[PDB]
Design a protein around this ligand. Sequence first.
Ligand SMILES: CC(=O)c1sc(CCOP(=O)(O)OP(=O)(O)O)c(C)[n+]1Cc1cnc(C)nc1N
Ligand SMILES: CC(=O)c1sc(CCOP(=O)(O)OP(=O)(O)O)c(C)[n+]1Cc1cnc(C)nc1N
Ligand SMILES: [Mg+2]
Ligand SMILES: [Mg+2]
Ligand code: NA
Lengths: 802, 802
Amino acid sequence: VIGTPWQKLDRPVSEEAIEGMDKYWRVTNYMSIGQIYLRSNPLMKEPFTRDDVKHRLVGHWGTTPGLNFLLAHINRLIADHQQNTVFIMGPGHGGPAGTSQSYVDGTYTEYYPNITKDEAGLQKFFRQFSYPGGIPSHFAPETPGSIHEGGELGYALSHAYGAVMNNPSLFVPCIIGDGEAETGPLATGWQSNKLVNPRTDGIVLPILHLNGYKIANPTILARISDEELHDFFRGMGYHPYEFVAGFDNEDHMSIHRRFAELFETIFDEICDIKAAAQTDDMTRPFYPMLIFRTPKGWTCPKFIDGKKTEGSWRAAQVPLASARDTEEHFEVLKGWMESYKPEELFNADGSIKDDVTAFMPKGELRIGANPNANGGVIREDLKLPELDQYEVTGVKEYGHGWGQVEAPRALGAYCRDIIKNNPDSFRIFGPDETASNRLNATYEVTDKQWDNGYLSGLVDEHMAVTGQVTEQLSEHQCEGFLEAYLLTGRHGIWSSYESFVHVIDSMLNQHAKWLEATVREIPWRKPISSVNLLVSSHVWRQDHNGFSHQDPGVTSLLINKTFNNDHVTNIYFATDANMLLAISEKCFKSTNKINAIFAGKQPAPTWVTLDEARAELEAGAAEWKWASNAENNDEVQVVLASAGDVPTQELMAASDALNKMGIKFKVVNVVDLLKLQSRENNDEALTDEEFTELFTADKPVLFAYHSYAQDVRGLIYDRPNHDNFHVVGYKEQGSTTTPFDMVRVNDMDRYALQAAALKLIDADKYADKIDELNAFRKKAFQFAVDNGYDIPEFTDWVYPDV
Amino acid sequence: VIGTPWQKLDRPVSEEAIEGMDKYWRVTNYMSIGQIYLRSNPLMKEPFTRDDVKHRLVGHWGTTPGLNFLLAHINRLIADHQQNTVFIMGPGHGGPAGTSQSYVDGTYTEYYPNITKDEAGLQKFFRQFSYPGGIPSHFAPETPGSIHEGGELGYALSHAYGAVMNNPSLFVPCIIGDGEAETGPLATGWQSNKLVNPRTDGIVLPILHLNGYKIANPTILARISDEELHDFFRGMGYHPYEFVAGFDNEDHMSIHRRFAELFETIFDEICDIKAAAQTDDMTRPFYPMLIFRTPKGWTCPKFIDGKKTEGSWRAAQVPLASARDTEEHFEVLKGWMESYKPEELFNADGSIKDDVTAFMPKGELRIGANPNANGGVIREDLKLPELDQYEVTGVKEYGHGWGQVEAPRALGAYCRDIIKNNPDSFRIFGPDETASNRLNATYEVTDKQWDNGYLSGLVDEHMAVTGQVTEQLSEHQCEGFLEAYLLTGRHGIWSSYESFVHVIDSMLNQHAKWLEATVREIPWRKPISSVNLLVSSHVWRQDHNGFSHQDPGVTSLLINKTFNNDHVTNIYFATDANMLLAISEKCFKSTNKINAIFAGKQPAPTWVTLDEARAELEAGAAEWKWASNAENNDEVQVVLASAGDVPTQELMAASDALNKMGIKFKVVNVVDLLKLQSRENNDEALTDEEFTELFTADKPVLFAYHSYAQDVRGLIYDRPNHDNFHVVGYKEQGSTTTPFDMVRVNDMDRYALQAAALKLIDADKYADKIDELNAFRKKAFQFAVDNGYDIPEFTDWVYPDV
Ligand SMILES: CC(=O)c1sc(CCOP(=O)(O)OP(=O)(O)O)c(C)[n+]1Cc1cnc(C)nc1N
Ligand SMILES: CC(=O)c1sc(CCOP(=O)(O)OP(=O)(O)O)c(C)[n+]1Cc1cnc(C)nc1N
Ligand SMILES: [Mg+2]
Ligand SMILES: [Mg+2]
Ligand code: NA
């Protein structure tokens, strides 16, 4: 247990804590300005001149003094209540507030021993901010205390709420930009309080950093009427409190006492909510939220060159852009830095005085040191059930190509038992698609958690105020909740219709970048569980829907995060249920990855045994010798290669037909796509030798690919024999139609694959046969048109091994 | 002018209109069920049997009878008030409500003459829904009345609001799913009413289709308390009205009279708002919104097999899935269809009776016929200013590589004059980045439109209640507003930081698919203006930000919409301002496209004259002979090829160095990326002959690419000489650092490009030189570290022609 969760003070905040909070705010403002502006002389020792100012002034002043003020008060809170706390910095461009926090709390020097607590350390701390060889502009993963960089705005609330799930002792003050609040993802993030339980989960305190402005405009929320603003948050299930400061001549000490008293009223209400939830965990309470209204750039010069700067969008970037070049800007900078009175905050040796930090939390309650903000320190391996009990044994008993299994159902049973064995640290998310993607065997041991109104057992099924499945019709919520759940040391999976995974492409990009920086240069940030995404209900079999639901292209986005041997991205095609089981065990064991797991949910053949899936998954691509009819590679007339359940089914039917014509070929299945890249681009890929063995040194290769052919073509560009690959992929053809028609219009159906194989072998010799196959595809189509179902010869085909 | 906008009735709705609305609702429910279930015998003539039921039952019943009820009332409204109206179907899976609407209003037969108004037409109309060779499941662009397919949920409100911008006579009832309302984009879409003006823009009426459920869960908005629901919409600036029907035994006629009276109160308030705005266009009014609460699946059987179906998520997909296979499901279907009493709705010849449609609007006020729902019918070409006045003439007067121009500034001046010449039909959108991406010359002739509180001229600049620039910190809003603005026949552009364009990848996918279907098979849907997206503040020069802001990968997404010779997607790299001007003229003239226009905003050299940009843009890729030093292709030791402003600058510096070493090469610039693909994949690309002429038959090609190298490698896979291309792209390296460091860490800087060129020519011979260049890159880096700015030799370099 960290600290003493949810305890009220029952006395006023002491005047000593108020004095320490004002010193914190002044020292973090001073050091934030130092980080932005100063390359040397951090204490302004004589002579302090323009030569000490950075040659390239980059940064974001405006948000920062508001964050520094909140962080003083959140530190004071944590210390007085001993409260287990992780904050979210929505405006992650306020990086200096986050580095200054860690430097003040001591974690920065503990993690970065060269940045010492004295004048030499402080000089280095100032220069290194946003500087070549130094540290990023934003609250990056290399900053102690960060689980959210806040570079691409909008995910503050999904991350805050995902962090408190199954984390009942954890308090998350979530600082949200008022511009950020204009984004789609942030706007829906407010509603997460209908999806957490106040007994079994922790508590988020949203703090709207209502500083009036974004970069070059006011914000929507700052300029609507106060009555609209309050109705808005009340309508979303909060009790809104509002603090206003900095717009008049109120002295800073008074402002701190008034905020502290407010923040104690807010926390007391949170503690009341927490105590009440021990007895009534079914009534959803109105959680406090804080509207925090202060001037953007607070404490910087009010006017610069006749332009209003404090209390304006003009405070957003770097005030005094000429500070190095003109004595006029330099004099203003010097007076600004002096207004914090650093001679009271730093000892002569340049260490921050003890009376600045006596009010601060200590040990693991510190914001930089809490293990929830470095969740791999808390993470434990899942207690996984034995895989073999889930195997589809139909392949062993009856043959390769057996049955009509809906593949994700085996993964559902496996997830069900993972939740059973790990009852509060593995969650499932779905955007109203858990049952649709066939993972609902999980409801046998848990419920979808819903903390909002109930009506009737006639309609509410598998739903309770507490449970380990979460659904909301928002891919952004599912992805954001899951990410923070991983970042605080837990585990899980979500599922999406494949075309809609694109809604969160940009979130996958940011989490891949978090992983990239981490695996490369932050070894103190320990490994977290991987994002596991079941990409299902795919392009080939969106039977109730149509062309809007046909876009397998997240493959292509993911290929853009496969560099430097980071190995943070995996693209897997689950050929069948036994392959899916093998991939899933692997993904549930992995760490520091995004794993995109493609599987169809339609009734489909099972191709491999579980033991075979395990070996094949390891290699990445494998010959299926029981399906090949060639003796060796020299005999092979064409390589039949596929990735995806549907391309594989169609290739296999083509192979059966090609066999019967006396054509010689081998069958290669591809599961782990990026293992096709060269060793030069991927040091864990197939060697050229293994690749050549699979795909031959010079026979034609027909490659039936689940997604866009572009992907495979770009990936094998420097491989031996790549000029002989013919890649067939999805090509933006399709509608609401039968399963044969969908493969037909993309040249993916078995008859077109048989034709393409013939064309690659001898176009002249097989001209007639190619024609007959093309004519058969027309006939099968006319049959679907006239009759309303696909031709039996198509649908009724079973691989001859069965 | 269409109809008589914003007129009140001043009498009750007649009892004849109520009777016609009930017949409409019954006939559209009946035909929607017919579309889903029936392959033949649409009037249930003797014998009506299971053999008439579709073999594959696919569709979405639950939303549909709610949409049919609203559409009866919206038709009645349009007719009585003669109101210019386009509706949005958020739940686009309710396609049968939209096809039934068009069939009832007459447009379906006018556009589709084979689907006639009689028993044979009706049989064909039923069978073709969601059927091979037939029509889509959703409200697709081939349906008269659609500007929004609603397949990927969330964009209903940005589309509704973009449609009414500069459209003051237009009324848009926007039907929003209550599951859809859980998405990010929909949640922020509510706030658009702070960004429209009630005098100069039209009016959106959001109608929340609060049917209690999404696919397999209740919805958040249906289960919060009524007081939260109302506070929520009031807090977002609406006057909420709520209608509740269908949960008790109230007869249908009474329900219609009560709704009609409500809908007239709502419309009267909209007409009052419209009249008031003629005098006070500065006070933002509280626009009505309608909470419409009815049972999902309304009018279907209450229980099926002991399970509650009407008023449940179980109504979502296809009730009675066994209707063809069991007499039990068939009998239930038969009684359901009979409950609408079709013998009262259809004449003996199977035409819909005149008394079903006497209340309907006629002519161009019909929902299927309004030209705002087919905006290419209204669209006019922009009055474009002459391009030559914007040219950067520094290249002509001083030489290739001249100056420090911020390229988007020339596009800003051009946009300024486009707005001047087309003052109410060209808009700019930006996610708080218009000034940051340098398009702010537009503010010289217009303002950012902001209909929310003002404070002071000290902070509000270039902002007014009416204007043709719109900003909100939401890429989803900018993209959605713009799309509907184009779809209703107008024009514009938006700009985004390049890495954040990914936020709307999935919207680009849906609009590309809309374009695909349209160019292929909907010739009555006339061409609309193109989406023009200035992709700027790119990966190489995000000076105040860092790694989160480095992702040029929307190139890769866009490559996935380049099929079938649809030609709906363009990727352009603006080499400099004169190239940007030429690309922009082209894009502003184009139709039916998404145009992604890459340009850097940093101070940068201008390479080509405007006349040269015009010729080069047409070819797609061009040799720069004034920069090449080889005589002919046989002399060429390496092809220096680049795409993007920064890769080009670095390649050009490498060329200057390579020249001075006596290396022979040619320089090729690439602007129109997809023109690199083969003719087989792109019938407007460079021929093999032109390609070979640019890139040689067999010399090595060094290709410096702005984005991920994967893209170029996949694109040129079947081109002559592609095995000799070495593609250098962004490789997920970078942080907050100097401009040299950013190109350095991706091997993109001039010294690494010079080295790579040497390595391709003779690795052994140039081993030492390659070493010295590698060592110089280390030195330049150490210099940035020690000094705080890049080495003068790097920054001060100007191409020798200047
Ligand atoms: C850094 C950057 O690229 C910023 S900071 C900023 C203004 C944020 O204002 P907010 O009110 O939220 O925060 P404040 O500084 O505390 O006032 C924008 C638009 N941007 C560009 C941007 C655009 N779009 C998205 C999704 N994310 C970002 N980061
Ligand atoms: C069709 C499809 O793929 C549907 S329909 C649906 C439920 C919508 O419920 P809503 O309450 O909005 O509408 P209703 O039918 O009127 O009750 C979902 C989750 N989906 C999958 C889905 C997921 N995510 C997104 C962005 N879009 C869609 N279409
Ligand atoms: Mg702000
Ligand atoms: Mg609904
Ligand atoms: Na090749």
